[PDB]
Design a protein around this ligand. Structure first.
Ligand SMILES: *[C@@H]1O[C@H](CO)[C@@H](O)[C@H](O)[C@H]1NC(C)=O
Ligand SMILES: *[C@@H]1O[C@H](CO)[C@@H](O)[C@H](O)[C@H]1NC(C)=O
Ligand SMILES: *[C@@H]1O[C@H](CO)[C@@H](O)[C@H](O)[C@H]1NC(C)=O
Ligand SMILES: *[C@@H]1O[C@H](CO)[C@@H](O)[C@H](O)[C@H]1NC(C)=O
Ligand SMILES: [Cu+2]
Length: 150
């Protein structure tokens, strides 16, 4: 199982609810995190076990409350973060530059939902972060952006 460190999840982490869409927080929230476009962006999670595979899909819908909001115009998932296998438990953090994606809608002031997709042997698990993309974000704390190793 995993928890978003940053940007923060829509709602409280409930382990048994991670099998549901957006961790059973299906409705979009208004308390969005500001997320920088200038390349200082990241996504940090915490996993209780390894190995696991993890990636992320994205919606540019303000009201992201269904799977279909995370599909592109050809009907596949809008992959914001490529799937990869992670071999260490604890913290795992990937740089994320929304600018790099091949999607109209990604600009300063734009709303999005990042849904992390995880499989570590105990289900297909999900958590969602509601963000607003900004040109820059000052005082963006990066301490949580480490990779634990053994
Ligand atoms: C947004 O507010 C909800 C409801 O109180 C809370 O559960 C969640 O942690 C908040 N999200 C962030 C990113 O602060
Ligand atoms: C972005 O989301 C906020 C809620 O936090 C909302 O007030 C605003 O209208 C949204 N932007 C658009 C263009 O829908
Ligand atoms: C939609 O996303 C899928 C990956 O899930 C990809 O095969 C397809 O090229 C994408 N469509 C685009 C980029 O318009
Ligand atoms: C964590 O590992 C991934 C590759 O698995 C890498 O992209 C990322 O930069 C690493 N994070 C840090 C903070 O080193
Ligand atoms: Cu688990």
């Amino acid at each position: 199982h995993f928890q978003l460190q940053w940007p923060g999840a829509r709602g409280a982490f409930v382990a048994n609810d991670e099998v549901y869409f957006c961790g059973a927080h299906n409705n979009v929230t208004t308390n969005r995190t500001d997320f920088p476009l200038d390349g200082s962006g990241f996504v940090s999670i915490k996993s209780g076990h390894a190995p696991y595979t993890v990636g992320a899909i994205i919606s540019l819908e303000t009201d992201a409350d269904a799977w279909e909001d995370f599909k592109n115009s050809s009907g596949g998932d809008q992959i914001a973060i490529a799937y990869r296998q992670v071999d260490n438990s604890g913290t795992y953090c990937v740089p994320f530059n929304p600018s790099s994606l091949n999607i109209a809608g990604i600009q300063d002031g734009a709303n999005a939902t990042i849904q992390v997709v995880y499989t570590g042997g105990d289900g297909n698990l999900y958590q969602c972060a509601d963000v607003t993309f900004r040109t820059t974000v000052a005082n963006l704390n990066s301490s949580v952006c480490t990779n634990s190793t053994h």
